[PDB]
Design a protein around this ligand. Structure first.
Ligand SMILES: [Zn+2]
Length: 427
């Protein structure tokens, strides 16, 4: 029972023991296949190893639901190097490759062990009959729902195709379901259980937001004399990402940093399908050490810094973006740059998209959630107190008694006066 898990852990990867006992607590509940489980912890090996382990353990194949296509390839190629039979069904996947795999799942004792899928492909009318041949033949081991908060209409990243998966679990009661996420919002948590129709009750496994290696400091653009210098000075003490709003803002900073010595390259949807995949592969190979990107770039362990030039659309989103730093456990720095003009620029767009929705559909409780998400982040910088403690109130996590890992922990007087300095700078 417990013996099989440890023997299959060190064999494939090379791990003496689990990172946290909560990882074993989650894994054992999945291995059991008795209940439906909810996993909520930061990205990396930890959370993935909770579905990757019982899949090989139990006899059958897994259906992993992840929306990111580029993320799917990053996790299938790393899995293949660990010697596992893994497949990935996406929209870009050709019909010749499709029939090779479509006939594989319908055949006796299929060759592939792990199957990656996007919500658009799984819920589709075309693939719909293929899973029924595994539904009846008992080959459907588990149902994996990565990035679970996209079915919320209260969450920072609502993806509509996530709603189709809702009744899918209630339709297929034969296999247990695992809901994986990082966004620990109580309204979103409750929504995940209801919208996905998860088997009541759900064994919830949650990990704290705080990370010792991360330093969260808030800088203010409205009071900095040389902002481009202040940015490269932070950048020099270090791979790493510099997030911002527009495709032209990152294009500006990619060359504005490069000239100062610290080489940086831009990333967004504006770059070609071949260019996007190239600069992403040129990032891992440290020829692109510093990467300037938008919301589009969402894995590497060595992420020394996550600086936000422009204020993020949501408080939940900022946590997801900044929390990509120091996956290895090594020290990293997460800086947020504030300006009431940049603030207003987003607030105006947020109010413009919401008003366009009301002009077509009408008023909704979900329409208010988007606005309230940004307001939760505008307070994060404009308010006095510890940065890690502000994360704790938003998601509901425990109060982390921090020291030398936050701006308030380093100087609760210098940043304090900087707030009073911001108000007088208006007129
Ligand atoms: Zn602090």
């Amino acid at each position: 029972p417990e013996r099989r898990v440890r023997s299959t852990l060190k064999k494939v990867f090379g791990f003496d023991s689990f990172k946290t006992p909560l990882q074993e607590s989650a894994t054992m509940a999945v291995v059991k296949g008795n209940k439906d489980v909810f996993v909520c912890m930061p990205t990396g090996a930890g959370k993935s190893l909770c579905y990757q382990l019982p899949a090989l353990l139990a006899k059958g194949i897994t259906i992993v639901v992840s929306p990111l296509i580029a993320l799917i390839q990053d996790q299938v190629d790393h899995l293949l190097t660990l010697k596992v039979r893994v497949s990935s069904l996406n929209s870009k996947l050709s019909a010749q490759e499709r029939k090779e795999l479509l006939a594989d799942l319908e055949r006796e004792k299929p060759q592939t062990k792990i199957l990656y899928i996007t919500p658009e492909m799984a819920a589709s009318s075309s693939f719909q009959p293929t899973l029924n041949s595994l539904v009846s033949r008992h080959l459907l081991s588990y149902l994996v729902v990565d990035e679970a908060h996209c079915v919320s209409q209260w969450g920072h990243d609502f993806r509509p195709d996530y709603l189709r998966l809702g009744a899918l679990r209630s339709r297929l009661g034969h296999a247990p379901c695992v809901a994986l996420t990082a966004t620990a919002t109580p309204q979103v948590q409750e929504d995940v259980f209801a919208a996905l129709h998860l088997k009541k009750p759900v064994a919830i496994f949650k990990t704290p937001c705080f990370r010792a290696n991360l330093f969260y400091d808030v800088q203010f653009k409205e009071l900095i004399s040389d902002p481009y210098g202040n940015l490269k000075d932070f950048c020099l003490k270090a791979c790493g990402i510099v997030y911002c709003r527009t495709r032209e803002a990152c294009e500006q900073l990619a060359i504005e940093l490069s000239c100062r010595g610290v080489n940086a390259k831009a990333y967004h949807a504006g770059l070609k399908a071949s260019e996007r995949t190239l600069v992403q592969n040129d990032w891992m190979e440290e020829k692109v050490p510093v990467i300037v990107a938008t919301i589009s770039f969402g894995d590497k362990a060595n992420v020394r810094f996550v600086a936000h030039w422009n204020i993020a659309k949501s408080m939940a989103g900022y946590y997801q973006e900044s929390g990509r730093a120091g996956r290895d456990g090594k020290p990293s720095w997460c800086r947020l740059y504030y300006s009431r003009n940049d603030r207003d620029q987003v607030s105006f767009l947020i109010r413009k998209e919401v008003a366009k929705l009301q002009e077509k559909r009408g008023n909704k409780a979900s329409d208010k959630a988007t606005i309230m998400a940004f307001d939760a982040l505008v307070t994060f910088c404009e308010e006095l107190g510890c940065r890690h403690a502000a994360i704790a109130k938003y998601f509901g996590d425990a109060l982390p008694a921090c020291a030398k890992g936050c701006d308030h922990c380093q100087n609760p007087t210098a940043v304090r006066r900087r707030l009073e300095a911001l108000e007088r700078s208006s007129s």
